[PDB]
mmCIF file of C-alpha atoms and ligand atoms in Angstrom:
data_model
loop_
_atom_site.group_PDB
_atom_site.id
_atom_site.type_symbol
_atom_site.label_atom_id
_atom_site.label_comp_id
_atom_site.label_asym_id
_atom_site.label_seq_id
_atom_site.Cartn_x
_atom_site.Cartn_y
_atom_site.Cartn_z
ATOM 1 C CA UNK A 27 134.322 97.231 117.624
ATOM 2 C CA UNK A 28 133.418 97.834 113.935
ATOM 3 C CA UNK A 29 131.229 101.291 115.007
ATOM 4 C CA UNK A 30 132.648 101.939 118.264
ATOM 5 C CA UNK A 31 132.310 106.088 119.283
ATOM 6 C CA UNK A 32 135.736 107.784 118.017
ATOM 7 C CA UNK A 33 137.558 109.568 121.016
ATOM 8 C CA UNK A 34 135.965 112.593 119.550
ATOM 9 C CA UNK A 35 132.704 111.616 119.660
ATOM 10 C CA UNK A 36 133.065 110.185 123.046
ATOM 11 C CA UNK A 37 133.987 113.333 124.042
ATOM 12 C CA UNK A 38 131.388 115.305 122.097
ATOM 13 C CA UNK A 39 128.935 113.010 123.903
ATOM 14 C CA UNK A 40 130.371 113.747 127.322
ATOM 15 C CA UNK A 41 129.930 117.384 126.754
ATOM 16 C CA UNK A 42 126.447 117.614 124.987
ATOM 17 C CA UNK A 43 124.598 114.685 126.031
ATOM 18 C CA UNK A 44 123.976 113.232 122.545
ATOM 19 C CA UNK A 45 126.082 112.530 119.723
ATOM 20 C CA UNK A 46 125.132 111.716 115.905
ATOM 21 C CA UNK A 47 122.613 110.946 113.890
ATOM 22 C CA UNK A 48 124.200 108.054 112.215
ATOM 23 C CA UNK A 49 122.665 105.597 109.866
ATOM 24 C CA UNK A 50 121.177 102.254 110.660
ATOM 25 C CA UNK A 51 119.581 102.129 107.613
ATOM 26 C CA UNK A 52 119.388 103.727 104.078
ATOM 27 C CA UNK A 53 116.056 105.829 103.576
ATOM 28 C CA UNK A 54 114.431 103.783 101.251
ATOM 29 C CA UNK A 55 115.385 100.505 103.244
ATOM 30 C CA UNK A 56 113.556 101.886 106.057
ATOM 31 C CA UNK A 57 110.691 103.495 104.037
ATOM 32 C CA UNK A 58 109.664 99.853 103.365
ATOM 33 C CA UNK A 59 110.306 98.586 106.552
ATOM 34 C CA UNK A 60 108.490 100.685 108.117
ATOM 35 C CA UNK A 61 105.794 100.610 105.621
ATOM 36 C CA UNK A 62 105.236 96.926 106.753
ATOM 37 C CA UNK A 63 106.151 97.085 110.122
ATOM 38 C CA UNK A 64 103.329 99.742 110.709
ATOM 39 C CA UNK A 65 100.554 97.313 109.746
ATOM 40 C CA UNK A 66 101.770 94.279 111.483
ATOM 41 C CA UNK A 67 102.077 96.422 114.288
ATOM 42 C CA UNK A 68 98.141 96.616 114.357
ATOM 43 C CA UNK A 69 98.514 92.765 115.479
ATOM 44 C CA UNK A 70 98.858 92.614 119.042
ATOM 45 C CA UNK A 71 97.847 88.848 119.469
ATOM 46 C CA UNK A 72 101.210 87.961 120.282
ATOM 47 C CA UNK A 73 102.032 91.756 122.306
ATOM 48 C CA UNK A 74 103.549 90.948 125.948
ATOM 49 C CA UNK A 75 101.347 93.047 127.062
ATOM 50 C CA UNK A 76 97.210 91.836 126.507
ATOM 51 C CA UNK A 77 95.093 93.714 128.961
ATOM 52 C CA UNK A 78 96.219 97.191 129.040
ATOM 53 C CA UNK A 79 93.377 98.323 131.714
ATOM 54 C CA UNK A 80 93.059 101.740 129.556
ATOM 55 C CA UNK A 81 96.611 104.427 126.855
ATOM 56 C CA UNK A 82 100.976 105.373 125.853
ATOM 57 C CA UNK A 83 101.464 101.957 127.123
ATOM 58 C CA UNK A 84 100.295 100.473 124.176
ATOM 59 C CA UNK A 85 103.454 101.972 122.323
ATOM 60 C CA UNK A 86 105.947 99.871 124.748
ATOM 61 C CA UNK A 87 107.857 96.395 124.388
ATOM 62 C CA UNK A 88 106.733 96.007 120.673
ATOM 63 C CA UNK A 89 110.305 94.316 120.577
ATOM 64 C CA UNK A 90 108.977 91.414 122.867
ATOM 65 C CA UNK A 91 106.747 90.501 119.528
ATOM 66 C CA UNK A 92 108.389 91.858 116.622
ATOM 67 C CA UNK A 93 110.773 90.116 114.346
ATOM 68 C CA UNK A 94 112.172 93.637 112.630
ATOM 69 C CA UNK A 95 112.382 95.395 116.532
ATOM 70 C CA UNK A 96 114.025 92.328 118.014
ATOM 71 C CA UNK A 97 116.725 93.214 115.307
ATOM 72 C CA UNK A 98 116.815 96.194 115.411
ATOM 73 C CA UNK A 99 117.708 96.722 119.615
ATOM 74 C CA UNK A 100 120.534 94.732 118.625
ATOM 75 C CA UNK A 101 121.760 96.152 115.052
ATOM 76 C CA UNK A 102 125.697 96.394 115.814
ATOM 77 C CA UNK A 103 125.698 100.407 114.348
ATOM 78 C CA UNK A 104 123.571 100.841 117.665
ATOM 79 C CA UNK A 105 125.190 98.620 120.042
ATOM 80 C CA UNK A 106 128.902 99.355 119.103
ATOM 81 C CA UNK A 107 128.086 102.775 119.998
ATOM 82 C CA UNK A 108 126.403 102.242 123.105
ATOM 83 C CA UNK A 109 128.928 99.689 124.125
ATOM 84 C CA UNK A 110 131.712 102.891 124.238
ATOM 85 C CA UNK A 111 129.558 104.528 126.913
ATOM 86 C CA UNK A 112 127.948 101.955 128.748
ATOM 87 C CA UNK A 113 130.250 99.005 128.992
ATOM 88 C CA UNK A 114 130.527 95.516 128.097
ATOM 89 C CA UNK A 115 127.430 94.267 129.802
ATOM 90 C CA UNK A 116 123.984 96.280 128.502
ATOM 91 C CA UNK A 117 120.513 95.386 128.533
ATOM 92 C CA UNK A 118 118.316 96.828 126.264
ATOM 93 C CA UNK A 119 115.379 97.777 128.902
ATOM 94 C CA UNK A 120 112.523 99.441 127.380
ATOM 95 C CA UNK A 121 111.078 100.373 123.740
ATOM 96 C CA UNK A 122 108.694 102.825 123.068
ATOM 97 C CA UNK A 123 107.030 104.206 119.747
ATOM 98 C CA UNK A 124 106.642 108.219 119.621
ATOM 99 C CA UNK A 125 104.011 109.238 116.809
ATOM 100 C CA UNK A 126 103.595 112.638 115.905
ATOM 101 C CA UNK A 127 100.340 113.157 113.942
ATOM 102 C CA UNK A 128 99.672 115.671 111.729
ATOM 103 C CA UNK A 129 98.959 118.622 114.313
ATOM 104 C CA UNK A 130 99.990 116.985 116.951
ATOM 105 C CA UNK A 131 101.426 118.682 120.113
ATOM 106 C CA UNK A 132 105.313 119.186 120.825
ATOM 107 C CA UNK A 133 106.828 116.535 123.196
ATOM 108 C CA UNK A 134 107.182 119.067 126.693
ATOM 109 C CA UNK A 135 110.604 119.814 128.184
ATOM 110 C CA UNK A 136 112.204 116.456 130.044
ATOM 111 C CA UNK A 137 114.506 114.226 131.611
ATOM 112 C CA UNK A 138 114.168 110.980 133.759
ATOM 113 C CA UNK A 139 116.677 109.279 135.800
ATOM 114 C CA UNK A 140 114.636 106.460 137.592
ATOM 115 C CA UNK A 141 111.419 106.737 135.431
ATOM 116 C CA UNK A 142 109.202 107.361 138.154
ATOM 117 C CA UNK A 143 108.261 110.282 136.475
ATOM 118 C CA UNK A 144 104.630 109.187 135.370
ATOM 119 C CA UNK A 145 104.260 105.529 138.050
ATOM 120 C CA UNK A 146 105.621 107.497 140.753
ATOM 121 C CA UNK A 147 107.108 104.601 141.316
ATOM 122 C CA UNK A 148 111.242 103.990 139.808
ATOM 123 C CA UNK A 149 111.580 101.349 136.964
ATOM 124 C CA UNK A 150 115.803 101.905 136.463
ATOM 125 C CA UNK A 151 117.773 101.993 139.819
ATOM 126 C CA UNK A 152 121.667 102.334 139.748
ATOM 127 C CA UNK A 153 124.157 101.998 142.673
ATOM 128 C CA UNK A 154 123.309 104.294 145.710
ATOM 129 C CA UNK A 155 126.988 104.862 146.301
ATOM 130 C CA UNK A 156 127.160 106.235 142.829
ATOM 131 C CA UNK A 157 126.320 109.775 141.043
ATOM 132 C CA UNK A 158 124.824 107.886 137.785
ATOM 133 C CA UNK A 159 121.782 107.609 136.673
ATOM 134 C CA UNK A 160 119.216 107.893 133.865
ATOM 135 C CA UNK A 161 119.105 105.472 130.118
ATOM 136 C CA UNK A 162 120.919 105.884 127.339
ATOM 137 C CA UNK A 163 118.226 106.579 124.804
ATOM 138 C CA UNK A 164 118.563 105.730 121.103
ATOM 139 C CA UNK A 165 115.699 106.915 119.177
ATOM 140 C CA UNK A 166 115.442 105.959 115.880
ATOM 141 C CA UNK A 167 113.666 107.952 112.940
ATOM 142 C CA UNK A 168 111.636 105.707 110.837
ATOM 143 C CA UNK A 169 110.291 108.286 108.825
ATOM 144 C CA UNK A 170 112.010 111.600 108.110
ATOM 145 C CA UNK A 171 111.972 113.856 111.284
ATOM 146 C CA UNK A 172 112.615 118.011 110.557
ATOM 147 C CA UNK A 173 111.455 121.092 112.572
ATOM 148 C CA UNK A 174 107.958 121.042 110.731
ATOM 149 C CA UNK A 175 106.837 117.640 111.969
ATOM 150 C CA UNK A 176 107.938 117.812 115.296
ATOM 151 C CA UNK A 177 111.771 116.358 115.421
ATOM 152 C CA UNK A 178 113.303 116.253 118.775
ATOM 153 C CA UNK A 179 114.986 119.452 120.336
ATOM 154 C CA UNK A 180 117.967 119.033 123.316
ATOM 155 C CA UNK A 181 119.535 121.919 125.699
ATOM 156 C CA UNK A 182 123.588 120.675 124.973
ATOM 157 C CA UNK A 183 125.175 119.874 128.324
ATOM 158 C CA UNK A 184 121.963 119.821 130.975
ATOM 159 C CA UNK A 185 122.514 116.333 131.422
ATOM 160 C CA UNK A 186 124.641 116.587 134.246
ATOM 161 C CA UNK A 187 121.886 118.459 136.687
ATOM 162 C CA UNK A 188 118.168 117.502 137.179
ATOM 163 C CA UNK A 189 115.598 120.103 137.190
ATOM 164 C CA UNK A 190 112.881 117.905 137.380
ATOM 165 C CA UNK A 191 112.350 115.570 141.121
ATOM 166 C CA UNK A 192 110.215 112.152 139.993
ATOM 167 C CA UNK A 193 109.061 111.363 143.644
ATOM 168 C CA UNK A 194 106.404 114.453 143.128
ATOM 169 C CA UNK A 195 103.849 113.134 140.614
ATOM 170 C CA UNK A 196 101.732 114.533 137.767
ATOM 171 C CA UNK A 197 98.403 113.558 136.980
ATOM 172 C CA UNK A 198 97.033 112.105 134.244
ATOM 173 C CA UNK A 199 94.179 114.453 132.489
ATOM 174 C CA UNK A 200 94.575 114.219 128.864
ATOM 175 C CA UNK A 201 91.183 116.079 128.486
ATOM 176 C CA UNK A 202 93.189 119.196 129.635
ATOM 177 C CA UNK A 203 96.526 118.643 128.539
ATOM 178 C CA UNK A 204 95.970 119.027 124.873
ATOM 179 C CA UNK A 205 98.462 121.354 122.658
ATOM 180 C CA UNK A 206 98.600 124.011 126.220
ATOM 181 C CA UNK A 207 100.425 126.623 125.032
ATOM 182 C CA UNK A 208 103.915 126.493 126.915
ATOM 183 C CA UNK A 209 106.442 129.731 126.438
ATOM 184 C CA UNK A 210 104.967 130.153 122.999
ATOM 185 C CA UNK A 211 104.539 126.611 121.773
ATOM 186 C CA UNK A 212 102.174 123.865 121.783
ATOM 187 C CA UNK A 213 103.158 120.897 124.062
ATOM 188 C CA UNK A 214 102.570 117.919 126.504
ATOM 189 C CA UNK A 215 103.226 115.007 128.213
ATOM 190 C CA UNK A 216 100.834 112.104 126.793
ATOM 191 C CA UNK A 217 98.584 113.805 128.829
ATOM 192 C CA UNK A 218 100.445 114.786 132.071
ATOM 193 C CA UNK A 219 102.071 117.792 132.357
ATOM 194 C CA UNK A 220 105.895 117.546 132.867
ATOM 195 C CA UNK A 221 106.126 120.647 134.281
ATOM 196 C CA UNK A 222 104.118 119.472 137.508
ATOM 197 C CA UNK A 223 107.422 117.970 138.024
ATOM 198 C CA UNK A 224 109.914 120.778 138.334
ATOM 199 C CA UNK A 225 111.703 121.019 141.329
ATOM 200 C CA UNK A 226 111.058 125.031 141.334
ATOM 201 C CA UNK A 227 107.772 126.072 139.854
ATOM 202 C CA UNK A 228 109.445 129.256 138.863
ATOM 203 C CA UNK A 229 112.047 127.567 137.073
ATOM 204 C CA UNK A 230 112.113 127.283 132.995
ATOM 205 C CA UNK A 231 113.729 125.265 130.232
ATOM 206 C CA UNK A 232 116.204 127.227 128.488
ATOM 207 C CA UNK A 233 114.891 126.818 125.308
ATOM 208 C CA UNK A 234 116.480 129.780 123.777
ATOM 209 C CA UNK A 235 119.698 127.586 123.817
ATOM 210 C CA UNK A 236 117.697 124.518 122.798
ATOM 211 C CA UNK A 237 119.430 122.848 118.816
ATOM 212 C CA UNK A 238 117.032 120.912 116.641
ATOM 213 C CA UNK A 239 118.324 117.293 116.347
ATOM 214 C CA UNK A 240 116.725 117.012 112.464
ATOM 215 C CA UNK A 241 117.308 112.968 110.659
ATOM 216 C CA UNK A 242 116.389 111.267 107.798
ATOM 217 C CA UNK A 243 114.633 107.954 108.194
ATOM 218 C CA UNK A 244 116.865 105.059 109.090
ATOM 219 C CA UNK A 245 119.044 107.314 111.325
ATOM 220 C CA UNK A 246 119.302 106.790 114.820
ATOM 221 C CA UNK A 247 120.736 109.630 117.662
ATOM 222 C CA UNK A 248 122.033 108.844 120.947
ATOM 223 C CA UNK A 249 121.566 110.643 124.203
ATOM 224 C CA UNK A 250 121.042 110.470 128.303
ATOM 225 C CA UNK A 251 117.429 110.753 128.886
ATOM 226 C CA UNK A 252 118.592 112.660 131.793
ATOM 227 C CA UNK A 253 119.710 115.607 129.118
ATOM 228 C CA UNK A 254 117.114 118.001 128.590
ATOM 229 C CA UNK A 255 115.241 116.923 125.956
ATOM 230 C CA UNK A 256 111.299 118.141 123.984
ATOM 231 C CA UNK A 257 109.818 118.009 120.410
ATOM 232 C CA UNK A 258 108.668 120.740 118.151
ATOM 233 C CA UNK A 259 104.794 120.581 118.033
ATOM 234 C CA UNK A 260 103.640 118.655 114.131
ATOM 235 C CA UNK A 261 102.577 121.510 112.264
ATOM 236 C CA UNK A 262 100.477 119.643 109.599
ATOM 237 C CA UNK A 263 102.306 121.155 106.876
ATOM 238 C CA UNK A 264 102.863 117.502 105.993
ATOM 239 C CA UNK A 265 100.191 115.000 105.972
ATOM 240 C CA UNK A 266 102.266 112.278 107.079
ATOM 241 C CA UNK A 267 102.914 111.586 110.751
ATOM 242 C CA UNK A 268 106.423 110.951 112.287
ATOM 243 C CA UNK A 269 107.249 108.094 114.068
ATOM 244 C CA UNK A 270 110.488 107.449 116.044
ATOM 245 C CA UNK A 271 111.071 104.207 117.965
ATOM 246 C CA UNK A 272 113.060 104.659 121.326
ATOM 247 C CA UNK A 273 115.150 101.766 122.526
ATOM 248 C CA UNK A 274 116.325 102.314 126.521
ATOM 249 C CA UNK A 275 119.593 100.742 127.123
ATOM 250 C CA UNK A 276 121.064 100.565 130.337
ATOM 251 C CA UNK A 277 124.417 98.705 132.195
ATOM 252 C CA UNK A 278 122.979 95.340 133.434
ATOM 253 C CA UNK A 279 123.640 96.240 137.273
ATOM 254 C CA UNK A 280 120.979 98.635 136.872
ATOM 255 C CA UNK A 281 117.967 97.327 138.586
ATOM 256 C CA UNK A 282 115.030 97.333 136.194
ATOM 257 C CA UNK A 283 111.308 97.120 137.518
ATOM 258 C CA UNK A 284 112.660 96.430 141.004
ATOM 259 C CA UNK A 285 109.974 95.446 143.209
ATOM 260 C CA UNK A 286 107.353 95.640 140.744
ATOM 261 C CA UNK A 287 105.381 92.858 138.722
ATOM 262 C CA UNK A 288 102.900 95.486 137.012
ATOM 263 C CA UNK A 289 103.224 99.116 135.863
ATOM 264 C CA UNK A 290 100.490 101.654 136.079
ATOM 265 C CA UNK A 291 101.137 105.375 134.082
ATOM 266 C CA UNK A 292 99.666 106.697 131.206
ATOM 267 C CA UNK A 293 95.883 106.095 131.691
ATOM 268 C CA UNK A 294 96.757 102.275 131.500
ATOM 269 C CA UNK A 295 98.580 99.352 133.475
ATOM 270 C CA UNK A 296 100.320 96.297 132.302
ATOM 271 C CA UNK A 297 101.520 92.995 133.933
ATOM 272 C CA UNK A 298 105.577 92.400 133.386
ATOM 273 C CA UNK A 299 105.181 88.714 133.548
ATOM 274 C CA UNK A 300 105.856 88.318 130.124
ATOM 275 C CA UNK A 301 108.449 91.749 130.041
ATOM 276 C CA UNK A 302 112.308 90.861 129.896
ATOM 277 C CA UNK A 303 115.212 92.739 129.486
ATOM 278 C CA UNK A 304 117.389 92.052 126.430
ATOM 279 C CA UNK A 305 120.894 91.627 127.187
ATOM 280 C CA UNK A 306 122.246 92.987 123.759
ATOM 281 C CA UNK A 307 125.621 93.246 125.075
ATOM 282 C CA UNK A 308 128.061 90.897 126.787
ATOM 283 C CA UNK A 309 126.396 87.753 128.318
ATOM 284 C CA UNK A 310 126.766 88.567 132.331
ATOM 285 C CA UNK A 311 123.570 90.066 133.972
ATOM 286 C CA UNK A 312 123.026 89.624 137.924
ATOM 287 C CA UNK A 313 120.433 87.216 138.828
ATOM 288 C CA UNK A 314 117.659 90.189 140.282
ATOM 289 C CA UNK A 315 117.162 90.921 136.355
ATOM 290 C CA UNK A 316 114.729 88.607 133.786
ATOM 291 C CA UNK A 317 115.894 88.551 130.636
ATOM 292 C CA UNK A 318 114.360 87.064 128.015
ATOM 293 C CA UNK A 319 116.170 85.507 124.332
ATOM 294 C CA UNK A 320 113.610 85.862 122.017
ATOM 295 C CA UNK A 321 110.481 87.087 121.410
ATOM 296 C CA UNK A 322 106.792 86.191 122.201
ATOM 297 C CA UNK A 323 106.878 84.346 118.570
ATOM 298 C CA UNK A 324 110.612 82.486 119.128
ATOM 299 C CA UNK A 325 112.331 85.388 117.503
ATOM 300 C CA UNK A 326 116.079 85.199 118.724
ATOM 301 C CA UNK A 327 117.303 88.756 119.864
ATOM 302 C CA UNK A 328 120.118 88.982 117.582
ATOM 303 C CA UNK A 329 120.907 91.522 114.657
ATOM 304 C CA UNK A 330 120.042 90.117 111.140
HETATM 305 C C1 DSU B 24 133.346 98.672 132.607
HETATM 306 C C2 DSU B 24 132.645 99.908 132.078
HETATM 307 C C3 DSU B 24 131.318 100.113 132.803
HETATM 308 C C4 DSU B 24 130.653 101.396 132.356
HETATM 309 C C5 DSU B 24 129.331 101.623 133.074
HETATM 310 C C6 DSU B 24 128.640 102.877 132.544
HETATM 311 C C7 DSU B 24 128.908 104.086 133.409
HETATM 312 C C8 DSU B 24 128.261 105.349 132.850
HETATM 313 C C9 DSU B 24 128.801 106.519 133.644
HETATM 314 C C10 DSU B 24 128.203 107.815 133.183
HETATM 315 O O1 DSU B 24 128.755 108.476 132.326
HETATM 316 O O2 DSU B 24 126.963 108.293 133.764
HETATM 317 C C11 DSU B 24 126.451 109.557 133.337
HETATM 318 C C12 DSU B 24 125.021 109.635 133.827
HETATM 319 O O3 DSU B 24 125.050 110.138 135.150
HETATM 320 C C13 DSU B 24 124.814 111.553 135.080
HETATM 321 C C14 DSU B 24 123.628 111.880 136.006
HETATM 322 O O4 DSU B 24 123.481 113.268 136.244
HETATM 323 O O5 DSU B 24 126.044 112.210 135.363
HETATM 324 C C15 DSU B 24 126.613 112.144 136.643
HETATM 325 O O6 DSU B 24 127.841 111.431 136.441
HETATM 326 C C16 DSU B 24 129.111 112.093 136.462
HETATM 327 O O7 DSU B 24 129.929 111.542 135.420
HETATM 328 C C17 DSU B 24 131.221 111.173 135.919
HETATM 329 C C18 DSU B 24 129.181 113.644 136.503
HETATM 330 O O8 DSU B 24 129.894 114.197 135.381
HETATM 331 C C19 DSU B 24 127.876 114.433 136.610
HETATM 332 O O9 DSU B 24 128.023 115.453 137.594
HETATM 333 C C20 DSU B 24 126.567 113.664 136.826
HETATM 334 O O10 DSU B 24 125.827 113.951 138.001
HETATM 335 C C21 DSU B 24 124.593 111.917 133.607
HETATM 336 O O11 DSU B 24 125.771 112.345 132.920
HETATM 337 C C22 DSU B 24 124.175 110.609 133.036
HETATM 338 O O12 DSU B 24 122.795 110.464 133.300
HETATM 339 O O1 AKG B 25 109.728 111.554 120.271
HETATM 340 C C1 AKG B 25 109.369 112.354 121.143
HETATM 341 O O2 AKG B 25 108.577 113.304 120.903
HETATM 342 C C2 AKG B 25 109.952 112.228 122.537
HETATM 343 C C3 AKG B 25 111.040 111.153 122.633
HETATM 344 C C4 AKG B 25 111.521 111.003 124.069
HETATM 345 O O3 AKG B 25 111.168 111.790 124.941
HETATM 346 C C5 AKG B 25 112.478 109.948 124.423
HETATM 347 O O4 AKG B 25 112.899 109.172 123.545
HETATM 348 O O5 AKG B 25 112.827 109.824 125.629
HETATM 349 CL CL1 CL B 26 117.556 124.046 130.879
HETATM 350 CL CL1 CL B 27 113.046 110.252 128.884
HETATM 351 FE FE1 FE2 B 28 112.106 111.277 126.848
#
């Protein structure tokens, strides 16, 4: 395909975990994008998700309403690309908005493979005869993201080995988790604390080999979310917040929300009776997985 991975890249990716940025968009086209996108946003009449029963919930599945998301989960620069890891059947699974306020808190150490992590409860499930697991994450800058207002951080080639076991839990208790000083910086969990999950409470990250991942709005960077992964805390410098937008893609055997038909995490829960995956890729999906074609307001799920 027109922006397939290069065998270099693939390979790259293989090793770290991640590969780009690379562009979706130009800066300014996504300066005004996201300039209107933001206040439509503050419409949720037509969200999938009404009650929220809070809440970080409130930043998921925007795509199931949006006209510019439903796009954008499906823009071919993304889906080429995840097409070369993931196959020729993909669902998109999962979107997610991650502010950064001026000030706010660093994003703590991570990764997920079933994303039980905050439900304690698993929302992706692959084979059981196979050694796979996690999402392939593509998160999406739609303003500028650098060092000073808290761009993502990864530790290269951690993807391969969890340190962190999702069937403990972490409790919710944003009151106390707010910018706790971690090894010297600033960070949290949207009000859990990840580290509650480490499989050895001695353990640390090793953030002393951790790389910046710095982008320019419109860019886009792919990576396992079962790579170590965090955010530099928002230091205020600027007065404008970052925002990147993280669409979860996974094969379409990959059982998503098995056995569930709500989701509680986050201080909130939601109902998934309007949720469906997107298939953004290919156009064979096993039967245990709803998908849905367009959004809430007859948006078809295809790039424009
Ligand atoms: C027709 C084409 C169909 C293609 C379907 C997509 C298959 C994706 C396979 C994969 O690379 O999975 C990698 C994920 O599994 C993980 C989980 O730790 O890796 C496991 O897979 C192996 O890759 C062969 C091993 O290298 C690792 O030890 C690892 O445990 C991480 O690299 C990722 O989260
Ligand atoms: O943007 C952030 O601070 C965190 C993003 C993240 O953890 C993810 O996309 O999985
Ligand atoms: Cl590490
Ligand atoms: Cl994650
Ligand atoms: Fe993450």
């Amino acid at each position: 395909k027109k922006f397939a991975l290069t065998a270099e890249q693939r390979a790259s990716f293989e090793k770290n975990g991640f590969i780009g940025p690379f562009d979706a968009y130009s800066p300014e086209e996504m300066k005004e994008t996201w300039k209107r996108t933001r206040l439509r946003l503050l419409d949720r009449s037509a969200a999938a998700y009404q009650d929220l029963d809070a809440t970080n919930i409130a930043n998921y599945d925007r795509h199931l309403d949006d006209d510019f998301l439903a796009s954008h989960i499906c823009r071919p620069e993304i889906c080429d690309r995840v097409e070369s890891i993931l196959g020729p059947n993909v669902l998109c699974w999962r979107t997610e908005f991650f502010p950064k306020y001026p000030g706010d808190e660093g994003t703590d150490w991570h990764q997920a493979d079933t994303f039980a992590n905050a439900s304690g409860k698993p929302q992706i499930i692959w084979p059981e005869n196979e050694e796979f697991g996690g999402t392939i994450t593509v998160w999406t800058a739609f303003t500028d993201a650098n060092i000073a207002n808290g761009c993502l951080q990864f530790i290269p080639g951690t993807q391969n080995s969890m340190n962190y076991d999702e069937t403990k839990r972490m409790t919710y208790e944003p009151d106390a988790n707010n910018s706790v000083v971690k090894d010297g910086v600033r960070r949290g969990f949207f009000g859990y604390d990840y580290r509650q999950l480490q499989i050895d409470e001695n353990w640390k990250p090793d953030e002393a080999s951790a790389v910046p991942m710095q982008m320019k709005a419109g860019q886009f960077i792919i990576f396992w979310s079962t790579l170590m992964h965090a955010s530099y805390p928002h230091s205020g410098e600027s007065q404008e917040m970052r925002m990147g937008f993280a669409s979860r893609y996974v094969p379409s055997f990959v059982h998503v929300y098995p056995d569930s038909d709500h989701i509680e995490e986050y201080g909130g829960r939601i109902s998934l009776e309007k949720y469906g995956a997107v298939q953004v890729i290919g156009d064979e999906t096993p039967e245990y997985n709803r998908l849905v074609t367009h959004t809430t307001r007859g948006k078809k799920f295809e790039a424009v």
